[model samples]
Every structure is written in C-alpha cells, then in structure tokens.
Target chain A: EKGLLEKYNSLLEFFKNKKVIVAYSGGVDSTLISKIASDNAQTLAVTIDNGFFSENVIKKAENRAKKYNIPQKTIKIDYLNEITSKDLENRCYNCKKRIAEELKRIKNELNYDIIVDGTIYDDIFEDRPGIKAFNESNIISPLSNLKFSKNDVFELSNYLKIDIPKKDTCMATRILSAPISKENMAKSNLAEEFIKLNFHIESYLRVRYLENIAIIELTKNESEKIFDNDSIERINTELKKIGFEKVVLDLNFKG
Target chain B: EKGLLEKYNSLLEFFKNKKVIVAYSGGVDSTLISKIASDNAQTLAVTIDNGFFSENVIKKAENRAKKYNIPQKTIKIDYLNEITSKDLENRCYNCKKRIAEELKRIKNELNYDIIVDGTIYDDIFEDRPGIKAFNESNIISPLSNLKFSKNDVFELSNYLKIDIPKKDTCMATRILSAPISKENMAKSNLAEEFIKLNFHIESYLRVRYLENIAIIELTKNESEKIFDNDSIERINTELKKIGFEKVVLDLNFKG
Candidate 1:
C-alpha cells in the first residue's frame, strides 16, 4: 500500500511537468484530463471537428478552456469522404493514425516536448485496434499510464464539475442504411430531437444516411422507460417517419 | 442461526409425511435436492432419457442414486420433432413446455403427489419461459423456493456427497449440424470426441449440420490453441474426413 501510494504520488509529479496536449472530445474522460492538465502543467486542449460526432466537441473544448482560462484549438476537416462506410471501415486504422498525426503536428507547431491523449486504462481493455495505431505513431496516453480506469475518470470529471455532454459519440462504426446525404443528417437530427421530446434518454443513437434505422443503446436505468410497449411503438413509428422502415432496438444496448 | 437451522429441519419434517418425485437431471442442483428428499422421505429420482441429452448427466445421476440405494428411473422420450430447430430460429419455449408436459403425465401415472424439479434461483433469474410455464402446471421448484442459488446448491451437493455435472450438457447438442438426424447425430458426437482428444475445448461448438460447413465456437481460453496453423489444419482434416468441407470459426466470442 505504501509503495502503491508512492507510485501514485510519482504519477502526480510526472503530470506536474509535461507539455501536455489533451484530446478534448468534451467527453468526461478527455474533459477531466484537460481540466487536470490545465491546472498542473503547460496544457493545450485540441478537438477534431469530425462528422458523425454526436456532440460538437470543439465547442465544448472552447467552453472548457474559457471556463478554466486555458489554451485551446480546433481543426475542422472536410467530413464528406470521411463518414462513408467504405472509407469509415477501411480507413479506420488510417483515420485514427491521421488523427494522432494531426494532433502531433499541432503539438510540434506549438513547440510542446510531447503529446498526450486522455486514454484511460479502462479504454485500454476494450477491442480498440485504432489504439494500436496511436501507439505505433508514438502518441502518448498519460491517463492510461496513470492507471485511470473509465470509472476513475468519471469520478474525477464529476468532482471537477465539468458539464461534458457525454454525448453519444463514435466517429467510426459500420452501420448499413445510414444515408450519407446532408438532407438525411438533418432528418436524423430531427428524429434524435423528437425521441427526446418525451423521454429523458441518452442512446448512442444513429440515424443512418441511407435508411431511417435509428440504432440506439441506453444504460439499464435509462432503459426502463423504453420497455413500455406504446413508447417502443411510438419511437419505432417516429423513426420510420424520419425515413427508416425498421427501427431495430438492439436487445443488448450496444454498437 | 438456530432459527435458520430449525426452519431447515422443518423441510425434513414436511418430507416425512409425503412421497416425492425428484426430477434429477444429474446436475448438482437436482442431485442435492434429490439427496435431501431421499434422506428425509421415500423419493424416486427420475432422469429424462431424451435422445438429445449427453451421457454425462444420466451416468452421474445413476451413480449418485445407486450409492445411496435410492431408486433411479431413466425414462426415454423422443422430443426431436418438437425440440429440433434446424431451419427455424426460436424453439426453447415449445421444447421445454413439451418436455414438462411429458414429465407431468409420467408423474401423475406413478401416483406421486409431489413433483420436485431442481431449479436454482439463478436459473429463474435467467429468461426461462419454460420455468414459468412449469410453475403454472404445478411442478414444484424446491431449490428456488428455498432461495438456493448455484453456489448454494454446490455447497449442499458437496456436503451431501452428491456427484452431479455442473455445466449445461444439454445445450449445443443439436448445434453440431443444423439438419440433424439420429444417424448424423452419432457422427457429430464422434467428431466432437475426436476434437476432445486433441484439445481442452471448454466453450461453444463445432457443429456440422450445415454439411461441408463446420461451425466452430472455441472457448475464450481455447481460442489461442486454434490459431496455430498445424492445430487448425489437423482439426480441419479430421472434420473433413468425417464430412465437413468448409470450417467456419465463430468470431463473436466477446465477454
């Protein structure tokens, strides 16, 4: 226990020195890490403005920096070719590599000694092939090194009182029937907003560009409201009206 | 603790006044329940001799009862037509109900007043449509009523020296080949036995119902063993010699 305590203290000391770059997704983990880094070290929070990202993470990054009075930057890429299924699935490896490379480029331009992303230990446990790409590109994960699990990040985020949306986000997922059209994205936004009209819900919700299938998942506590047959039907119909023939409610609330 | 012991003693008192027909699957839950019923009262342990059941359960149950000089009845019933779902997706509900109905008929004809089934509380927690239906039909689940879970039954089984198999030996029996007949079922078992000789396969199956297409579900632990070229080739050769032309390893082994 004494050794463990000393190790933690050393980690705190290490974070106290680095010229860190936070991958500020505006999610709980990244936000918490950014907040902590800004407090302890020379920190610059960076948010990539990508399409299919449920929340405007860059806006949150700006708000976070403003609230904390830290340095912040955003790089908006043309997501026209990015969100397509072929590119999304095939280039997912390349995409993640590109993301890390972009962050490193910005970090170097700012003359930072090293770059850090808020990938905690719990995130390391998941089947994240892209994480390997990040490692190969020599991008650093400070939170993971600190042994910060997802729950640990959440606790720190809560304690810090950061208003991160925890917005249902995943930039790369292969879902057939999501229309790639801009019109469909607008319709999807309408559908997502409509689902929230009556229900206080958070689903990793996706209204695809091709089809009107609204794939969503909820925590067990949040799932109780969706169990009502009428609500289930209503949600299905609302999604159908938005352009999907079938709104498949995944029994397991997963991607 | 005294009050709990006294309440438990009352079950033996209740048994003294009744004849019990204990449904012994030779699984620990049923075996322990049967042991208790046998020691406290005159109990006839009945094992379902369905063609689908592996030899493990029946043999274990037989030896356990024989040790105690208790009557063990192995009754055969062809539930193949009702239970088999080679082409269809869902069949568990219909299968369990039909089996329960058959067991009920046998119990009534034997002049047994109480029909005891080995149902642990965890089994009830799982989505069992058949258990609810059985309860409606008056098959008493003493283990669950006693609030015994898997570990509880395991402890009791050990204390009472009742040898019972723990795993679901019934599942994946029909999964070897989709279109399974009595003759091919024997061949599939032979193939499984061959695979067993080579490896410690603890999870899932390699069913050959879809001829030329062998479906493999190697356990999470066994996954690494199959990755070797020699191991994969040898298994493929053995399966192909039996009849399978194509071997498809199931990729969906996630915790």
Candidate 2:
C-alpha cells in the first residue's frame, strides 16, 4: 500500500489514461464530475433506473447524454422488493452502500480497475453512514478526497449551465431509533399520489401517516395553496379512499 | 302613551293590517324578524342598501324576498352619515334613530305605521344601544318583545327553512370601534363580498375593516372553515387589493 500522497498521485495519474466506471445519478453535482472524467479520461457513465425517482428524471439523464454526446448507460432495477427498503435516516447508509457494491461489481465485470463515482463538493456531505462503506471500498471518491467543498461544485455546475432541481433524500423519515418500514412508504406513496392527482400540490411532497391520520408537507407555493384552503371534506374523502381514517391539514407545510 | 300591554297588542295588531317595513339586513336575527312578519302580516321587507353592506347581501335579500314572495323594497341611502357619525358612544343608537326617522317619513308617505325590525333576545338584555332608539321611535320589534333569544331565532329560522345568513352582528360588531371616516363602507362590504365568493360561508360574517385590515368573525363551524382551510390566500389577496393591509381570519370559531 502506498502513502496517502502517493496513493492520491497514483489515482490521479492512472485516471489520466485508464478506463473508469463513473457512478452517475444524473444530478448536476454528479453529472459535472462525469463530464470532467469523460473529458480527461476513458470513462463510461452508469446510472440506475428505479421507480422511486421522479417521472422525468431518467428522461432528463438520457436527454443530457444525447445533448452532451457522452457515453451513458442506465440499468433498470424494477425489482418491486426494493420496496422493502426505505431511503430514510438510518437507511441512507444502507441505501448508498447496497447501490455502491452493485456498481463496483458492474465496474469489475466491465473490466475497469478504476471505479469512479460522481461525488461532488456541493453534495459531499459528511456524517453520512454511506461514507464509511465508500471509504472502506477502496474505490476512489475524487471529489471528497480532493476537499472539493460546495462552492467548488457550484462553480463547476454553473460553468456547465447545470440546473439542479435541489432534490433531496426524502421519504417519511425513520421513527426515531427504529428500522425502516415498507408499510409506511406504501401508504405515504399512496397519499402522495392522491394529493398530486386531486390537489395542485407543487414542487416536492412528503406524507407522514400516523395510524389513520395523514399529514402532508409541501413546498412554500403548494403549501400556501393547500393550508389556506378549506379542503377538509375533499381531503378527508380521498384519505378515506386511501384507507386513512382522517386527514388533518397542517398550516405549516413542512419540507 | 299606551300601557305596555296596549302598546304590545297594538304593535302586533298594526302589523296584521298594515304593510309594515321590516328592515331586513340579510342577517339571521333580522331575517327571522322579517320572515316571521312576512308569515303573519301585510308587510314590505325593506333592506337599506348601503356601502357598509356586504356586496352579496343585496342579491341575497332579493333572492330571499323572491323565494318568500315578500314585498321587498331595497332603498340605497346616503344617510350613511348616520353610521359614520362621530363623537357618540351610542353611535349605533344614533344611527338607528336617523335610519328610523328616514324610514318613518317613507312609511307615512306610503300609509304604513308599522315597521318591524329584528331586535332580538340577547340584544335587549345586552343593552344594545341601537335597540333603545328603535323602541323610542315606535318601530315594532316583535322578536325582542317575544323574548326570542339568538338560539330561538336560529332554531325558528331553521325550522321554517328560511335561510338567514348566520350571526352577522358579531362579525360586524367584532370589527366595531374603528374611527369614523369620510368614506362610505365600500372596503369593508367589498371584503365580505370577496369572502362570499371564495367560501361556502354558511354563517354570518362581519367583514370589518380598520384602515384596510379586514377582521372577519364567523360563527363556529364557519370560522374553522374560514381559518383552517383553503381559499385563505385568495381571500387575503382580494381583501388586500381592496385597500386592506391585512385580512385576518378569526381563529375563535365562536357561535
């Protein structure tokens, strides 16, 4: 094993010539990293297509790949049992780690010794459990290892005119100190779909269900519309259809 | 002067024969008086049309009259000064007196001695300043004399299926104590109009304005609908545009 400085120099030096599997999410932060790798090294972008992502997200990635003429590939993971896992709180590490290991396998099968994930400074948040697995994997996270902070990532994205929609890791968060449950997400997703169809719920949404009660958080614009509305009857009816006993409208539309 | 018994009997007898002017404001208490009077006597339902009235009120009164076949006479008065009159603690009394005096001249010319106004149960007991002048001017308030409480009037109205827009006095009275102004009540009344358009407000609403601040007080269930539900922002925007700095939805959903 080489020293830290020597390891980093070797990583950067080999990356100047060798092929790498770029773990991409089609996010501005990640896409910028992939673009840089594609420009300087022999790189292929790999992203996952899962049902939980917004409808337009994969299309957006495909569109970006076509427009940029970058080599991008997506593998659909429609395995419905992914429903068994939640990407909330304690689950974030498990979520990232599980996906990363699969990605590493893919990278190895593709005959690339260098596995590069598109982790950027703007989003290289610490105190995350995924970081532990990522660091242990011995695969390179060039952005974090380079100490690329948020501003550095923003500069890169801004220069590329990358418009990130600021999508955050959101699902009904884990009950404190409790393992994630698929039951809650099913109900939450149902309630979310109901709100989207009937009400003009804008931007993002999160549904917190407690027994028969459904609490929804919306963006400022959408929150203003729903909170001030006298939709008790309408919301209650829909909630009942979704099997919630009652729906309570909260004036403070939470994130 | 007739004895109390004689005065009371005469008042009742007069309403039976004469086309009395019942000052109906499209509010529950007053509406009950008008409905009961119309049920028993040859009466003209007279609602004073002023800028202080909620915009939808005139149409409501007209519809009520049409529905009940009451001879409805709507008179738009510039005697708005009666309401805007300053320097009197019993301004309501003075305003009532002025209105009575004006209505008296019209009644005499029309050959009627009876004027049935809705001065009901809680009002006389509550030292309602307007009721004092009403009694002195010999305007017949059968509801007050019959000891009709607010509940009684509402119950009776509901029984008769005579739609009286619920407790408007509290709505209007809650917003009382604003400084007298040179302008007519276009703002306050318009705000109420805006509320009517946006909500299925089934109770009385006093859309009061204090220098462009619309303070709405609605009856119990209606109050909850107004405060906790949707259309709040739309109501605020319309009220603000109508010269109100703030449109406050009352949280106290009192009956």
Candidate 3:
C-alpha cells in the first residue's frame, strides 16, 4: 500500500529517537543508511578499518560523514589475524562474523543497543554465507527486512542525491580461494591502484591476485581497448614494480 | 639383489617372445621404452593423436620412430569430445580410460594380446588417477613392476645415448577446472611456442590457460631473466596477437 518514498521514510522512521550504531562501509547500502540515520536520529557510524579497503574508501567514508555532519568512528581491527587460507570456502562467513564481533564490542563501548548493517533484499539470493552471522548476532538489516532490491537502494540513493563511489570490495575476492594475508592484500592494493591510475579505468577493473600473478579483469568493451601492445607493455612494467610478477588481461571476464 | 642394469635387461627378456604394443608419447619414459622395444622382437608403438600435444612433440615422436627404425602408428582420436568442464577434477581419469579403450581396440584389431606402458615405479607414489585405467584394463606397466624410479629411467636414457627432450604434457593441464576447447588449446600452444622460441628457456615453462588470459609460469631461476622490461614488452606484443587478451608472468611458479 506504500510507495518507494513512503517505504523509505517509514523505514527511516523506525529508527527515530533510538540510539543506533551503523556499520558504515561508504558503499551503496551503508552510505544511504548512514546518511539517513545521522540526519534523523542520534547515530554513531562506525567504519571498521580491516586493512582490506583502499585508502580512498576510508577517505570517502570520512568525507561523507563530515559532509552530512554525522559522528564517525573509524576503528582499526586486526581482522586479518583470524583469516587464513583454510577458510577460503567460507571466507565471507568468517569475515562477517569477526567484523560483527568487533562491531558488537564497539556497540557495547558506545552504549548502543542495536547494530544495523546495509545488507539489502537482493543479497539473500547471492551465495552469501555471511548471512548466518547476522542471524546469530541479531544484527539489524533494515534494507533486507523492508524487501529493498538493489534497484530500490540505487533509487533511494539517487532521490537522496547521494553520490555512489565506484564499487569497492576486499582484494581477497579478486584472488581465487586463498588465505587473506596482509602481504597479498598489499600487493593486490598496489597493483589495482597502479592499474586504475595508469590506465585511467573509468569502468570496472579487478586485479585477481593468484600468488604473484595479477589477472587484470576489465569490462569487455574496456578490455578491447586496453589489450593493445602499448597498454600491455605499460601494465607489465608498472604492475611488476608493484610486486606482480605477471600482469594479464582477461578477455572472457564476465564481471 | 639384481641391480638396475640387470633388472632392466631381465624385463626386456620378459617381452622378447610375445607380440607387444607400447603406448608411446615421445617423452622420456615412453621414448626409452619404445626404443628398447623396437630393438627387441615383435613390437608395435602407438602414438595417440588427441590434438593435445604440441606439434613439436608429434614431430619428435615421428622422428624418433624413424631414427630407431621403430614401427609407429599415429592414431587420431577425438578425446576432447568426451571432455567437459564439469568433470575437470577427474579429467585425467576419464581421458586415460577412453584412451586405454581405444588402445585396447587397436590391440584387438592388430592381434596383439599384450599392451605395455612406461609408467615407472615413481609414478605409483604420485597422485595419478589415470593408473586406475591401466589396472582395470590389465595393461602392463613394465618399468613400475620392475621398480624403475624416474632416476633409473634417466640413467638408462643416458647410457643408451638417447637425447632427452624438454618435458612436455597436454595443454589441458594448464587450465584449472576448464574443458578443453580447440580455441583454448590453439591459443595455449601458440603462446607457449612463442615463449619457448623467443626466449631460450632451459627450464620449465607453462602458459597456463585461464579463460582468455595466459599466465606464463616459469621456473624460479629462469623467471629472473624473463622478468625484465624488454622481455615483458616482447612477450606482451607477441602473445596479444596470438588471441590472448592478457599475458602475465608468474614468479611464484614452482614447476
């Protein structure tokens, strides 16, 4: 019986006068929730510095908080300490549980009763083993409970005039199932940053870290342009210096 | 206790009278066995043309057969037809089983009751699923039964003044959990040939086929020379024209 505006407002209304601790990632879902939570109520947004994100993400998160006048807490957690190669099949599951544990600890310290994350309805269809963590911890996922799809979130973000940054994720996802080491993460970060900067990637790019090999996956159209002799030479030279022994362009990249 | 020379000689005596068919690949083990069998009586060697071998390997097999006056049969089989991506983990098992069946057919047609392969003792300890096919088909493994280690094979090859070529295998092994396609095989073959001919690789080289990308895996020592800028440039240009969207160098390559 409710429209998009009504549904979004009603969801935002649910958090009124409540002390909520929002898990902020400066990504699609989190950005919208953090902005609304900060504007509507007494909210403390926490961004866990798990050493998985590029520095640009942290900057954007902090900048968003500042621009919206939201109180932001960027806490560093050694989440990598608990991750190993053995947990690759369930890497996301373990990662989310650890991050949630950290968030719960911060929630307790800040005297907040509820911890809300940005998991939307569409994520349920994805092979996200991490959903179990929320079920176990009683963490609030408003977007999912409200049945908001990805399009719904983007619509809300657009209506709210929120600037969605380029899609960012953990460098671990770029690697084939392996342990999340600080070393691999650093190499991946440097290689990706180098590629993005050097190649002027306006579209999607991922440097799938397979040991010392950097498998550069680009959009099909973008890959066609980037597969030239000049680009390969430049990519090979720079990526090797960034600690990638090999830089490869993937033509059959689906994502 | 019989020494290697004594054991090798006695093994040859065992096959002297019976009509024997050797599964020849023109690699070290098969080459040695085929050479010895040719010198002995009532022998026929078969090379399966599965389209998986490099042209150089086929040439070598034909040349070695000619040089040794060995009777050779190069049989064409569409082994790739039975192959699909779903069964990659057991690919070798399936491939070997099918090939063995074909070999059995040839043996029946040619009136040879005995089929021999060059699987040495060392292979028994390896994670070789293909060995099961030999067991099921009652195919003979002379070298393994005689307890011939890989070192013994090499020693015999040396004493016989057999010129051992660089080790080569099916291009299918370079891909992880992917079905063999003619396109992929050709791309992989071309990339590897370009690398081998352009660079004097005295060590292992594998152009690992990951979709449209080529991950060039070299032995640690050999990779040192290949890691420079000039080599990268040449490799990039040459591999790109060969239908590779990207060519990458793998430094942590163990083999």
Candidate 4:
C-alpha cells in the first residue's frame, strides 16, 4: 500500500509543472490520469468522439470530465468513412494515428506543452498496435514511465474516489471482417442497448455483428438472467427488428 | 396409464391388415410409429435424405431401421438447389410437400395402402405448415389421429424398449433468412460436430448459421461445460476454420 501511494505521488509530481493534454475516455485508466494531471498541472482532457463510441460512453466521458472539474473538449469525427478496409484491418493503429494528429493540432492551437495518455506499463506488454502510433507521435505516457500497471491505476482511482467506468472497446472491433459501416454499427449499438434495457444487464454486454447476426455476449452472472422463455422471445424479436436476422446469446462468458 | 395404452392399441389397430409406408427420421416419435406399424402391418420405413439432414442423422435412421428389423429405403436429393428463396421462406410447407410427393410416388410404385408419419396431436396444435401439406397429400398421421401427444410417444417408446434418438430438425432450419447452401449447411454441421466431439456434449446442440456467424446453441447443462477458456478458444478457432468468421455460444438454452 505504501509503494502504491509512492508511485501515485510520483505521478502527481511528474505532471506538476507541465501544461498537458490528457487523452481521456472516462475508463479506469484515463480517469485516474486525468484526475492526477488536472489537480497538479494545467490540464485539458481531450476526448475524441470518433463515431465508434456509443452515445452513452460519450456522455459518461463528458460527465466525468465535468465532475472532476477538468477543462474538456470533444473533437467529433466520422471515423467509419475516414478509414479504409485495409486501415480497418489495422484499425487500432490507424485510429490512434488519426487521434494523435488531431490532438497535436489542438495542442499547437491551445499552446499546451505536451500530449499525454493513460497507457500504463501493463498495456505495453499487450499486443497494442495503437501504442506504436502513440509512441510515434511522441505522446507521453506518465503511467507507463512510472511503471504503474492497471491494478495501480484502479487502486489510485478508488483512493482518489474517481468514478471508474466499465471497460469498453470501440464498436468497430465488435464487427468481424465486415467493412465497418454506420448502419451495421448502429444495428449492433441499438441491439445492445435494447438487450441492456430490457434485461437489466448493467455489466459486460456486447452485441457482436457478424454480418446479419447479433451475438449477444455477457458476463456469466448476467448471461443466466436472460435465460427465461419470455426474455429470450423478447430479445429475439427486438433484435431482429433492429436489423439482425438472427439474435443469439453467446455461450462463452465475456472477459 | 390405461388411456395411454388405449391410444397405443388404437395406433397398432389402425395399421392391422393394411400395407403402409412409415415416414421415419429416427426421432422418438418416428421410431415409435415405425415399430408399431411394422409389428402390426406390412410396413416399409422410408427416409428422405434431402441434403438438409446431417450425415449422423441419416446414419442413425439407417441403424435404427436395421435394429428394429423394419425394411427401409433412403432417398437422397439436393433440396437446396431445388428450392427457391421464396420457397425457403415457407420452407416447412415446401419441403413437406416435396417429401409427401416422394412418399406418394413410392406408395403407388410399391402398392402400399397409405403413407403415414409420426405427427403427434401436439404438433397439430402448433403452427406446423408441414401438416397442411400432409393433409393435402392425403398422408395419414396415425399418432395424431389416435390423439398421441409427444409424452405419449415417449411412454410407448419406453414400454416397447425402442431406442429413442434425440430430437433433431433439418439443418436448413438453423439458417435464418440466408439462402440454404451446401457450403453453409456443411459449415454448421462440421462446426457442431467439432464442438460435440471436443466438449463431450451429448445433448441438444445447434450451430445456427446467420450468414458468416455460427451461433452454437446448447442445453443449459451442456452450455456450462463449454464456459471454460480452453473450450471456448478451441471451439472459436475450429468453427472459424470451418468457415464462420465469428463463432459464439447462444446464451439461450436449446429448446
């Protein structure tokens, strides 16, 4: 616990004299980074609304930024049209590259000294192609530099009483091989929204788009709650209406 | 219990002194129908191999027929090529109509008195478009006429010591709105076969095809068996190799 506090204080000290733009997504990692940076430095929480995030996620990002009293800006872009199929195959790299370019432009215009993100030491060990783009753009990762893993981020987040939102990936990742289209993305988004609303799933839920099918993935506990006949029928009917010809619950638990 | 016996006796009596062709598919209902019909009359068990039934299902039908000493014939056809997309929408009616026509042709060629199937009384109460085709073709449902429910078939099957196969529907029904193709059917068949062999699932398993995704549906008991990480990865990998871009377990229990 002492080690954790020491690392956290070092993180705050790293940002003390910097005029930084923190790439914020309202997730556990970014919320902690934003909280520490905003408290100790001239901080701007820049959220990129790349058309791949759900409305709820954007709202949460906005809400959290306001709650933390962090100066925030949302740069909206139609990323689905901007990226090619080849780019989609390497989507993380392309998306991060584009976001970095935009943040650099904003940094120059607003006279911010550096662009920082929530990339932690644990993320560096993963197959994160986006981290390559961030590195190429010279985006500083204070968490990774200070050797803070995800657990450290969560621990600091709870200690600081920051509202840590559920982990989520881009909607583009939910689709398998099919070219990312607005219609398909909307279908999956609406399908998941319908399932969550109707079945009261507040935990991990994913309506993966594999062409015309919506494969509903949930946590093991949440998965069992939707097993009733009435729930099954309602989900099937509602999802089909959301443009999925078939709606099926994925038997595998969401990680 | 007496009422059940009376119904079984009536089923046997209906076939006495008559030549009949029993439409058999190796299910509990059909196996019981064939047993009673063969025991009391001149019976020929005819199975339609319309490319929709799995190889295992066809083999099971053959094995059961031989086991019961019922003379049997399997007529194979590529019904996928024969049926139009419009016909696929009303697939049950169209498929049943073609099957009844085939049975009638056999009846005429062999001089059988009538064509009979294992459509129970419960089936008559359901939305079975196939029943209409049977009626129009003048095919007899001795089990339905005797007011036999599915439970009654199981009871008689148990009493007669008939080897009851797990219920199965044609593979074509597993695809939703997608044109039934040999490729898609084989994909689902092979995927399910792989899952069953790997996971040791002996109960209800359906690899539903919705274009590129294979939604694996299983009984509640069997679903839990595949929730392990190793099983999920193996199934996902194998099913993708079988041609599905995405493989997911359906959260809903197989019904």
For each candidate, the DockQ is: 0.01, 0.02, 0.11, 0.18
Q: Which candidate, 1 or 4, has the higher TM-score?
A: 4
Candidate 4 residue lDDT tens string, A1-255: 347778877887878898999999888888788888888999999999988888888988999889988888898986666345434577888889889999999999999899999999888888899889889988999888888977788877787888767777788877765577777888888888888888799998888887677878788666557765667768877888887866776645665
**Candidate 4 backbone collisions, by pair:** A249-B250, A249-B251, A250-B249, A251-B249
lDDT of 3 by residue, A76-138 (tens): 876666534556887778777878888899888878778898899888788777778755797
Q: How do the residues B79-191 of candidate 1 rate in per-residue lDDT, one tens digit apiece? A: 67633646334445555666677778777897777888888767877887768667767888876776665766666666666665645555435454455456566556666
Off by over 4 Å in 4: A1-255, B1-13, B82-87, B154-161, B166-168
TM-score of each: 0.47, 0.44, 0.57, 0.61
Candidate 3, residue B98: the lDDT equals 76
| Stretches of model 1 off by over 4 angstroms after superposition | A1-255, B1-7, B82-90, B164-168, B171-180, B183-188, B202-212
i-RMSD of all predictions: 15.6, 8.6, 9.4, 4.4
What residue runs in model 3 are displaced by over 4 Å at the alpha carbon? A1-255, B82-86
Whose TM-score is greatest here?
Answer: 4
Task: Please count the clashing residue pairs in each candidate, in the order shown.
Answer: 15, 11, 3, 4
Local accuracy of candidate 1 as per-residue lDDT tens digits, A101-127: 888898889888777777877888787
**Which stretches of model 2 miss by more than 4 angstroms?**
A1-14, A78-89, A122-126, A163-204, A209-212, A219-222, A250-255, B1-255
lDDT of 1 at B242: 79
